[PDB]
Structures are given as structure tokens and as C-alpha cells.
Amino acid sequence: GKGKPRGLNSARKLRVHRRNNRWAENNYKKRLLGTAFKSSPFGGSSHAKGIVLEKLGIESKQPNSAIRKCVRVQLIKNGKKVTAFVPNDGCLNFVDENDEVLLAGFGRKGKAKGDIPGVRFKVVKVSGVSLLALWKEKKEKPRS
Amino acid sequence: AKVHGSLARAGKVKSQTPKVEKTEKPKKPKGRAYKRLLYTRRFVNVTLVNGKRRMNPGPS
Amino acid sequence: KGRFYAFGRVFAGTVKSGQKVRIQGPNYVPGKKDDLFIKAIQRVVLMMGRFVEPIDDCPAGNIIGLVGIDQFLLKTGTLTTSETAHNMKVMKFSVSPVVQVAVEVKNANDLPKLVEGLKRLSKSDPCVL
Amino acid sequence: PRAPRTYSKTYSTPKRPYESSRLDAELKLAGEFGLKNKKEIYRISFQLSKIRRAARDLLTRDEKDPKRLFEGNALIRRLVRVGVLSEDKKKLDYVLALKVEDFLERRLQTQVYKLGLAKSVHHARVLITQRHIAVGKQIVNIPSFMVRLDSEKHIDFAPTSPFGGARPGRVARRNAARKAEASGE
Amino acid sequence: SDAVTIRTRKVISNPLLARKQFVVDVLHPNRANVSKDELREKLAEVYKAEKDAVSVFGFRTQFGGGKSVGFGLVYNSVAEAKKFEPTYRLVRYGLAEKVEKASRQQRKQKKNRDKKIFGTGKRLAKKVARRNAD
RNA sequence: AGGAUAGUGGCCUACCAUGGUUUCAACGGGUAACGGGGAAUAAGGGUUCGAUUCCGGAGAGGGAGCCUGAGAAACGGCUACCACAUCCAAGGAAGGCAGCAGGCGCGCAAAUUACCCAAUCCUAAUUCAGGGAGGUAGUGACAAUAAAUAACGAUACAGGGCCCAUUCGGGUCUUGUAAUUGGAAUGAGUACAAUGUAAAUACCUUAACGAGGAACAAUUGGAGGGCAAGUCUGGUGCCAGCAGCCGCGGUAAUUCCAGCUCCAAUAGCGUAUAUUAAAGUUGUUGCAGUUAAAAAGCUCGUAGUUGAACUUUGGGCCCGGUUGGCC
């Protein structure tokens, strides 16, 4: 016995010490206050319907080179700007300005990957054609 | 570097790679008969070791 | 909001409610796989002045409203079910493409309502562009 | 506003994906009698799992317990009504000792094989799903039948369906129409 | 062709409806998929009531092709059968009459076109005659 | 002590008494909180959902109030106000889809304005009348279970044997490969035709059909380690890009783009977000606390939690029950 009184009547005091020390993890503290329901631009959501303003680019750190051609997209359901990323090669000519886009996360749960800072979010679908079906091209590109 | 994603750098460097086409193999079997090849190739039609086994020995 | 009737006229066949017909586009030959649509029709309703009257079947030469198909055509349309035929004409109609006006939303947030607003206003009436 | 009908899944994938000999151990088990996928050795191992899970709970419970004297004796007879093992290992502790390839051995694929008539397990699985052989008179289109040990008196072809008789075919007749166009009218 | 062999099982005669209830087993080699009513006309001879007091539904074709499960119901009365036969089975047999009222969407709106009438309505019909055109 | 109440009761009323709950957490706030029977992962010990099939509750745009009736503070009943909203002759009158379809809005997001009481039941004077309760259907890769993508031949070639053992060439059983040329097996579709179904669709059935690589077709990821599968070829050269991490690309790229080959699962595969185990990285079983982050600077003390020993042990008689015993 090291601390934690084992006594059979004592079940309250080592339940409160259990629940107090429950507030130290990196996932329980964020499920307790609803981190995706007050903070966190995705409203508890794997996806959000987006609309792009225009194109930009963000550079990679040390050690590498080759600025990665990001995108600045605001969101419909909350109305605020955010930066994103197109994980692909080419096809940024295919995604236009001021048209519908549909984006998601990385699985990295925020906390941008290792390469480019301050970018959490990646592009799944633009105007309804899902550009992974455009890079490995077998699809309509519609009349704009 | 506010305008530094200048699109003269783009998928251009991919597009300056040449365009070719796949050659046409016969019909690979689809189903159990594909694995009928795959077991008998790995564990019956083998006579090679090179240590223990080497399944796709690219040209050494 | 606008789920707008397709003002149609059948030139062949008794058209039927609950029916599956091919849909085509403005300048299209059915050789390629792009922009031909294969869907079904919701309702076949008629209209007098300001009222409507649902029907079932009609022979040729009868204008009918056409419900729900409006999503899949732009300002004009043919919808065939013998896929060797051609498009029906657009005739290079008449007056007035013509003029331009800059239009902009205020208060920097209702851009989605504007872009859906005019991409639905384009399908609203074919005179404007 | 209605009553449901249930459903259940009857396999479970193994946990650690990639061990070289372990995947090739189930390539020996793939290569033995002509399977088509890797799922149908997952599911008898799943049936090995929750029967051995069922086998563990009576062995840890009491001796001269009638729940063990009922579902230990009724278990081992249903274990041998399919005839996985014989009378020699009927003492309720060999259900732990049962091994994969023995649940495989009483399948209708490798029972047509071992009882002549097919030359090959790859030819045997064809001779199940071509609307061929019955068990009794009941036709079986299932290559995973689990033979109930009481039709080796009677496992044969069908009365119809040649390679089985009573009409030599229909696609033989277009092959005989090739006779009925060259040397026939 | 190969002895269709009408065989009968669970032959239970009901005394309080003047009938029999029974399950027909049918093993029909070399020729399948016969009929509703040929098997009745072979069953209605071995039970000696009449030809058409029998009520079948069934011939559930078992797998393979050559075996089926039927279910017939012979009654011990001719005209009293129609008093208690299901009428869909009678119009399958053609002895009775098929009804034809309107469909669903014409009948229930007619109920809605029934409450607007005041009484028998011809008091309105005299009044909508005089006025219009007044 | 009465007033009402279907009857109990500070339920309400007048008088009188100052009382109720609490450091076992009341009170107050929050709650992406309907409550349970359960569901998911799973050594045991559990963590997290459960709006939703079953039981009970609340509500019918938001709060009130009321008649009829045995049963309602009903809402496919009414009255008034608010907030939405409709028609017109401008006088006024209609109003509740959190029922069933359907359409907006919001949308990461969710199906027909179908048939019919045939079934299970229900209501009424009562077989019948009725029931968008219900069942039948079209959308469906929301989930599960079974399992096609072609079989065996013959030649030839390399063989692997065995024995001729002198092995050029053999008999003998077996693998690939060169599509030479056969003979069968049909079934996914297709439909004479019957059944199924009240009615048809569809499954089970069943004539005439329905197969030689190109068809009647298998995709999705990947090939540095992680982690199984390339030191194969051509390209750009820290550009373009890859990648969940470590890290590659600056001229030979076993990672980028292609092409060949191969790996993994197979009618499915990834992808993203919340999850559970692995997390003996929340731990009661079961963590760590001299230096990895941490033992209040030290002590007193009320709750709380723990707290020495001692008080019929033993001996004997007999009876019946069970398990295993020259048996």
C-alpha cells in the first residue's frame, strides 16, 4: 500500500482521487468541455462545406525546401477564414477560385504534420468531383 | 513571400515527364485460380533459395 | 424558394408518371459518357392560370409541367430514351445577350448565398446570362 | 412498430497483420484443398475460438455439475455428429486439442475429393457449384456444407445433371448440334 | 412423367367447419412446376366430396427441381364452402365473382367529398340551380 | 380548525410554533442529459454510447384557460394573447405535417406525393363498414450470412524422382511452360412456360438460349524502415513532389512521375472524425514520487478512514446420506 487507503469502507475517497486525477489526459480534458463545440473550427465534424477565396502558398521548414502551395478557404456553417492544403501534385489549376469545396482533416488531430506549420486541413472534393478522381483522372470535369 | 506560390511552379514538372502506355498481358485468373497460381509459384514451382527464398528477384 | 417546373412539350409518345428516361444537355451527341444523365421523373403536373392539376399520361403535342427534373438541365433540354437520336435545336434564337452589371453582397459573409443565388438564377430564366 | 430479425457476423480477422511464415502457414492451409480467399479460414478459427471459449468455461467449472454433464456430453456428440474426430478421442478434453485442417477435412469440397470421382480439389469445388452432387436427395450448392457423417452410404451425383445421368446435357446438344450440322441435319 | 405422387400428411378433418386440413407433400421427378389446380383435380377424386370444394395454396418448389410442398383444403360442403371460403381463393378458382369498386385514391377522397354535403344535398342542388345564374 | 378535492396532504385559507438540508456535497451553475430493458470493444477488472424497434414519461409553433364525454386540461376539440403565416368583392373568414408520403431552410449528412386490408390486430349498433396502425412493393455497398469470374484433356519442352546407373535417350508418378487442337460442365444474365403473389415483381422451379482471352472481367492501396512485397528501366535534380512518424529529392532517387514485376485483402478496399483494447501511458485488481514531472517548510486538529489480545476448545457414543472399494 502506497497512499490509496485500501479499506473496504473507503470507496468514496479513492473515487474522488480517481476523478480529480482523471483531469490530466490530453483527450478527457477536451471531451469534458466540448472542445469541438466551442473552439476548434470543425463543429464536431470530420467535414465541413467550404468556399474558397483565392490561392496562396506556404513554405516548408528545416530541413527541406519547396513551398507547398496551400489554399485559403472560409467555411459556411460558421463563417470564418481558415488555411488548408492540397495533398497532391498538380491539380491546383483544376481547383478554381470562388467555387464549392469539401474538405476534411488528416487524422493528425490538429497539430500540423511535420512539414508545414499552421495548416490542419486537406481537400477532398471541389465542385462535386473529388480531385483524387482528377489526379488519377477518370472523371468529368464539369462545365463551370 | 506573400505571393510565393507562383504557379509557374506547378504540375508542369510532372507534365514534362513522357507519356507512355501499359502493355497488355493475358487474362489473369480472377478468384481461387489466381491463388492456385500464387501458391504453386511460391511453394511448388520454386527451386530457388538465395538464403531462404526470394520471391521477386529483380535483376542482380 | 424555387423547385421550378420544367415547361415541356412531348413530341412523341404518351409520357407517363413514374418513368425512367435519359437526359441530355445543350450541345451534346450521345457518343461520349460525359453530361448525359440517367434519372427518373417525380411528378407530371399540368397548369392553368396560377393553379396546377396532376395527370398521368399524355400523347404528343401537349405542354405539361414537369416536376423535379430541373436540377439536371441548363436553360434548355432534351430527354430521350432511344439512344441513337440527336439533340433538339437551340436555333441561335434572338436579341440581347447583352449588357453587364457589377453585383456585390455587402457585409462580407453571404457569399455562399450569392453564389448559389445566381447559379440558381441562371437556371431560373434563360434570357439572362 | 414491428419486430426485428437479428443478424450476426461469423468471422474475426486476426490482430497482427504481417508475419512472414504465419501468412504462409495459412498459405499451406490455402494451398491444401483449394480455397478462394483468406476469410474462410478466419471463420473456422472463429468457430475454433468460441467453441474453445465454450470449452474453457465448463472445464473450469465443477466436476459432477449437470450443466457440465449436459453441455459437455451434448457438445461432444454434436462435435462427432459432424464426425471431426472418432470414438477414440471421446473423453471431452480433446476438444481443446482440436486443430485447424480437421474442421477442413469434413467439408464437402474435400469429401468428394477423397471419395474418388474428382481427381482434384480444384475440380471438386467446381463439382459443387455447377448444380451438382446431392448429399441425400437434397441438392447442395454449398462448397462449405460440413457433412453430417450420415450420407457416406448415399453421397453420389444427382439423378439428373450428367456426370450423374438421366439426360446427357444441354450444352452437349449444341456440341451435338455441331454434329447435327456437319454430319447431321 | 415420373410419378408426380400426390401424397398427403397431417390429414386433420375439422368437424366444426365441415372440412379437412392437411399438408400435401409433392415429389415430382423429371417434370416440375405444374399448376395450382391439376393437383386438386387429382386430390378431389381420392377424397370423394366433389371436384371443387378443395382450396389449395402452395406448391413451394424445393431446391433441386422435383420436390414441392403443397397445402390444400377440401371442405365437406359445396355451397356452404363459399360462405366460408376466402374470396381471393374463389376468384382464383373463378366460381365466384371478382369485385371492382374504385381504387384507393378515388374512394378516400370520396369520403372527403361526403362530409361537405349538408344532408342529402339536393336542398343545395335546388339552391345552386336558382342562383347561378340567379 | 376549516374551503375545495375522485379521495390523502400547507393543496388553499385564518390563527399559532419557529422551523427544514449540510462538507456522506444540500443549495447554485452546467449538461451536444428523455429514463430503463441493452449495444460496441472484450483475460479478469472494465471504459464509452443508448435520439431509434420493447416498457414508462413529456409534447403536438410558445405559455395559459375550458366544454363534451366513463376516460382529456385532448390539440387530425374549442377560447384568448404572442410569433408566424393564407384567400379574396376591403366587408370578413379560414390556421397547425415532432402522423403518412412530399418540398423548402439548415445541411458532413438521411428514400416514393405507389398498391391494398391478403396477413397480425384494432374500433363501432357490429363477418362485411373502416384503419398512410399495418403489410406489399421501387432507392439502398447503413449493417450482416453463403459464394462466380472458367474445368479436365492431348502434344512438346525443361524437368523432379525411382530403377537402365555408361546417361547421349528411356518406362514409371508429378510441377510449370509453349493457347497447338479437343471433348465436356454450364450459370450471371435471357425467357417460351408454370408457380409464387388477393395482384404482379423477385427467390426456389423449367423449354430454346446463354464462353476460347478480346470476351460474359477485379477493384483499391502499396513495393526505404515501420511493415510483407525492387538495388529493374526512362524521366526532373531540394524545383516538382513523397510521406500518419523517422526522414528522402542538391545527376546513378531500392521513396517523386510513369512502365515491368511483385505484395495485401477480395466484392470489396482505403480516407476522415468520435471512439475501445493495445494505454501496468489513470491503474481497485494495477502506475510513479533520491536525481526522468512530483513527498505540502513544519506541526496541531474536527469530519473521513483505519485501530492489540481475551469469552465452547475438546473427548466419546449412535444414526442416516454421498463418492471410490476381494466385490
Curated annotation (Swiss-Prot), chain A:
Protein's UniProt keywords contain Ribosomal protein: yes
Cross-link Glycyl lysine isopeptide (Lys-Gly) (interchain with G-Cter in ubiquitin): where in chain: K55
Post-translational modifications reported in the UniProt record: Hydroxylation at Pro-63 affects translation termination efficiency. The stereochemistry of the 3,4-dihydroxyproline has not yet been determined.
GO biological process, one term: maturation of SSU-rRNA from tricistronic rRNA transcript (SSU-rRNA, 5.8S rRNA, LSU-rRNA)
InterPro entries the UniProt entry points to: NA-bd_OB-fold, Ribosomal_uS12, Ribosomal_uS12_euk/arc
Pfam families noted in UniProt: Ribosom_S12_S23
3,4-dihydroxyproline found at: P63
Other noteworthy facts: Present with 10600 molecules/cell in log phase SD medium.
NCBIfam families noted in UniProt: PRK04211.1 (NF003254), uS12_E_A (TIGR00982)
Protein name stated in the entry: Small ribosomal subunit protein uS12A
Native species: Saccharomyces cerevisiae (strain ATCC 204508 / S288c) (Baker's yeast)
Phylogenetic lineage: Eukaryota, Fungi, Dikarya, Ascomycota, Saccharomycotina
From Swiss-Prot, chain B:
Residue ranges, annotated region (Disordered): 1-34
GO BP terms: cytoplasmic translation
GO MF, one example: structural constituent of ribosome
Keyword Cytoplasm part of the UniProt annotation: yes
Residues with the Phosphoserine modification: S15
Keywords assigned by UniProt, alphabetized: Cytoplasm, Phosphoprotein, Ribonucleoprotein, Ribosomal protein
Positions carrying Phosphothreonine: T47
Compartments where found: Cytoplasm
Entry GO CC: cytoplasmic stress granule; cytosol; cytosolic small ribosomal subunit
Keyword Repressor carried by entry: no
UniProt similarity note: Belongs to the eukaryotic ribosomal protein eS30 family.
Other observations noted: Present with 37600 molecules/cell in log phase SD medium.
Function: Component of the ribosome, a large ribonucleoprotein complex responsible for the synthesis of proteins in the cell. The small ribosomal subunit (SSU) binds messenger RNAs (mRNAs) and translates the encoded message by selecting cognate aminoacyl-transfer RNA (tRNA) molecules. The large subunit (LSU) contains the ribosomal catalytic site termed the peptidyl transferase center (PTC), which catalyzes the formation of peptide bonds, thereby polymerizing the amino acids delivered by tRNAs into a polypeptide chain.
Subunit structure: Component of the small ribosomal subunit (SSU). Mature yeast ribosomes consist of a small (40S) and a large (60S) subunit. The 40S small subunit contains 1 molecule of ribosomal RNA (18S rRNA) and 33 different proteins (encoded by 57 genes). The large 60S subunit contains 3 rRNA molecules (25S, 5.8S and 5S rRNA) and 46 different proteins (encoded by 81 genes).
Protein name listed in UniProt: Small ribosomal subunit protein eS30A
Gene (name only): RPS30A
UniProtKB/Swiss-Prot annotation, chain D:
Residue ranges occupied by any S4 RNA-binding domain in the UniProt entry: 106-180
Disordered: region residues: 159-185
Residues recorded as bearing Phosphoserine in the entry: S183
GO biological process: maturation of SSU-rRNA from tricistronic rRNA transcript (SSU-rRNA, 5.8S rRNA, LSU-rRNA); ribosomal small subunit biogenesis; translation
Pfam families (alphabetical): Ribosomal_S4, S4
PROSITE patterns: RIBOSOMAL_S4, S4
A GO MF label: structural constituent of ribosome
SMART domains, A to Z: Ribosomal_S4, S4
One of the record's GO cellular component terms: cytosol
Cited InterPro entries: Ribosomal_uS4, Ribosomal_uS4_CS, Ribosomal_uS4_euk/arc, Ribosomal_uS4_N, S4_RNA-bd, S4_RNA-bd_sf
Cross-linked residues, Glycyl lysine isopeptide (Lys-Gly) (interchain with G-Cter in ubiquitin): K179
Record keywords, A-Z: Cytoplasm, Isopeptide bond, Nucleus, Phosphoprotein, Ribonucleoprotein, Ribosomal protein, Ribosome biogenesis, RNA-binding, rRNA processing, rRNA-binding, Ubl conjugation
Cell compartments where the protein resides: Cytoplasm; Nucleus, Nucleolus
Principal location listed in the UniProt entry: cytoplasm
Function as written in the Swiss-Prot or TrEMBL entry: Component of the ribosome, a large ribonucleoprotein complex responsible for the synthesis of proteins in the cell. The small ribosomal subunit (SSU) binds messenger RNAs (mRNAs) and translates the encoded message by selecting cognate aminoacyl-transfer RNA (tRNA) molecules. The large subunit (LSU) contains the ribosomal catalytic site termed the peptidyl transferase center (PTC), which catalyzes the formation of peptide bonds, thereby polymerizing the amino acids delivered by tRNAs into a polypeptide chain.
PANTHER family: 30S 40S RIBOSOMAL PROTEIN, 40S RIBOSOMAL PROTEIN S9
Family: Belongs to the universal ribosomal protein uS4 family.
Protein name, UniProt field: Small ribosomal subunit protein uS4A
From Swiss-Prot, chain E:
Site of covalent link Glycyl lysine isopeptide (Lys-Gly) (interchain with G-Cter in ubiquitin): K20
Protein localization: Cytoplasm
Keywords: Acetylation, Cytoplasm, Isopeptide bond, Phosphoprotein, Ribonucleoprotein, Ribosomal protein, Ubl conjugation
Pfam name, any one: Ribosomal_S24e
Primary subcellular site in the record, as a coarse category: cytoplasm
Gene Ontology biological process terms from the UniProt entry: cytoplasmic translation; maturation of SSU-rRNA from tricistronic rRNA transcript (SSU-rRNA, 5.8S rRNA, LSU-rRNA)
Protein family according to the UniProt entry: Belongs to the eukaryotic ribosomal protein eS24 family.
Miscellaneous notes: There are 2 genes for eS24 in yeast.
Name of the featured protein: Small ribosomal subunit protein eS24A
Protein species of origin: Saccharomyces cerevisiae (strain ATCC 204508 / S288c)
